[PDB]
Amino acid sequence: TQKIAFSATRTIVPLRRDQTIRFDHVITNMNNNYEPRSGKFTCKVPGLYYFTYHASSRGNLCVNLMRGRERAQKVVTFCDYAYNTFQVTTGGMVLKLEQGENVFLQATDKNSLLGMEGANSIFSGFLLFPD
Amino acid sequence: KFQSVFTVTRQTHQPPAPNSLIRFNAVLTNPQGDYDTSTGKFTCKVPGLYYFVYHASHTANLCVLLYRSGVKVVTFCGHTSKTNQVNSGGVLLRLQVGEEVWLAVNDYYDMVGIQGSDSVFSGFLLFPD
Amino acid sequence: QPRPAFSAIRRNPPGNVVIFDTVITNQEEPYQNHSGRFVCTVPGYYYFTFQVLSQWEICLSIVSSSRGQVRRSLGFCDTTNKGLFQVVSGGMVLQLQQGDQVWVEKDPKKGHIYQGSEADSVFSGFLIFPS
Numbered sequence: 001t002q003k004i005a006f007s008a009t010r011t012i013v014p015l016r017r018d019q020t021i022r023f024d025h026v027i028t029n030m031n032n033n034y035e036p037r038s039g040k041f042t043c044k045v046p047g048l049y050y051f052t053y054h055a056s057s058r059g060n061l062c063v064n065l066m067r068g069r070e071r072a073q074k075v076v077t078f079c080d081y082a083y084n085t086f087q088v089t090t091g092g093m094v095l096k097l098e099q100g101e102n103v104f105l106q107a108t109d110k111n112s113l114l115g116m117e118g119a120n121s122i123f124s125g126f127l128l129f130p131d
Numbered sequence: 132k133f134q135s136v137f138t139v140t141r142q143t144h145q146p147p148a149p150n151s152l153i154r155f156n157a158v159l160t161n162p163q164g165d166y167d168t169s170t171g172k173f174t175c176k177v178p179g180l181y182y183f184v185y186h187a188s189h190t191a192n193l194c195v196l197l198y199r200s201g202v203k204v205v206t207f208c209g210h211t212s213k214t215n216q217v218n219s220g221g222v223l224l225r226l227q228v229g230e231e232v233w234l235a236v237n238d239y240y241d242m243v244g245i246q247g248s249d250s251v252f253s254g255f256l257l258f259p260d
Numbered sequence: 261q262p263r264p265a266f267s268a269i270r271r272n273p274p275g276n277v278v279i280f281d282t283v284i285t286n287q288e289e290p291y292q293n294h295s296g297r298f299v300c301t302v303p304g305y306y307y308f309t310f311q312v313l314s315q316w317e318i319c320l321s322i323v324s325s326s327r328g329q330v331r332r333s334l335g336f337c338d339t340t341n342k343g344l345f346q347v348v349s350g351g352m353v354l355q356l357q358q359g360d361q362v363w364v365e366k367d368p369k370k371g372h373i374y375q376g377s378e379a380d381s382v383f384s385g386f387l388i389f390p391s
């Protein structure tokens with residue numbers, strides 16, 4: 001009965017290229033596999049997971065969705081641009097994960113990311129099937 | 132009886148009132164009747180962990196707010212002039228029996244999509260407790 | 261125990277069906293990377309979603325078939341049309357029978373999808389529960 005699910009928002013400082021994007025405010029964290037201090041989900045139960053985010057922004061934003069166990073690599077990059085305006089963008093991915101593998105979002109030079117009441121950014125994930 | 136799933140849609144060319152609950156009047160699927168199209172609210176029958184997500188089309192500014200039992204959980208805003216975009220948002224919530232979930236707009240209330248651009252709200256139980 | 265779940269992206273894609281040619285995840289192999297079609301084996305309720313990158317005008321729809329007959333549905337568009345990255349997104353639950361197919365279709369008049377290495381477009385789906 002593996003009940004694994006997290007949702008965390010960001011309330012935080014301008015992000016640097018290659019910096020892990022921390023979502024510091026936990027809404028949900030069943031099984032405690034997301035760590036708000038690091039911004040990383042770490043797989044304890046091998047299986048299939050869905051990851052998803054929604055990011056508020058006031059300019060150009062690209063984010064790398066990362067997977068790995070010490071040296072992570074980008075699976076995909078999502079970009080959504082905005083000229084002198086406010087936007088919300090989204091990305092998602094089904095991933096097979098093994099024990100110890102982390103999943104997280106990583107910043108780029110395109111770093112317009114807002115995290116506030118009234119313009120939230122959220123990172124979520126859940127177990128689909130263990131194995 | 133023991134599961135929970137819905138996808139509802141807002142089939143109308145007229146936007147919500149400012150600062151009001153968004154009613155999704157049409158049903159794609161809603162087998163347990165957990166979303167009530169007459170009130171615009173989801174009410175939990177089976178307690179446990181739910182995923183909620185929406186994609187809303189708009190041709191002027193739109194903020195969508197998700198509420199749980201009277202408290203604002205998350206807000207996402209998209210600004211546009213004349214042209215059409217999709218505002219999305221979503222969250223995972225562990226709910227007790229009787230808890231209500233709904234979407235609302237603030238002063239940015241536009242949900243007027245162009246032809247072929249619609250608005251949808253989905254939810255489903257992933258882990259019963 | 262069935263674990264049908266997939267994500268596929270655009271890299272070297274080959275009509276109005278949007279083919280996501282590069283498989284990231286395809287548990288139980290329900291998704292066909294050569295055609296862009298998901299095939300239902302396990303009847304039940306599924307979630308499908310896409311996040312697709314455009315720079316001009318794009319309108320997409322998740323469409324299905326039953327006994328080979330096409331079932332049209334809602335659409336989702338971004339018509340900003342300014343040459344900058346925009347992510348159009350959409351998703352829905354579908355109740356499917358064995359043999360039903362699901363895919364993403366573009367509007368023949370509004371079908372710009374970014375082609376390149378800078379960022380990604382994705383189509384995902386998973387079983388929520390059988391029957």
Ligand SMILES: CC(=O)N[C@@H]1[C@@H](O)[C@H](O)[C@@H](CO)O[C@H]1O
Binds near residue numbers: 281283293294
């Ligand atoms: C054999 C196989 O599964 N690999 C195929 C590859 O040959 C093909 O080029 C591509 C279509 O774009 O889809 C991959 O999954």
Ligand SMILES: OC[C@H]1O[C@@H](O)C[C@@H]1O
Binds near residue numbers: 141148153155
């Ligand atoms: O107030 C507008 C909304 O009410 C609902 O019944 C359907 C519509 O989208």
Ligand SMILES: [Ca+2]
Binds near residue numbers: 081
């Ligand atoms: Ca944008």
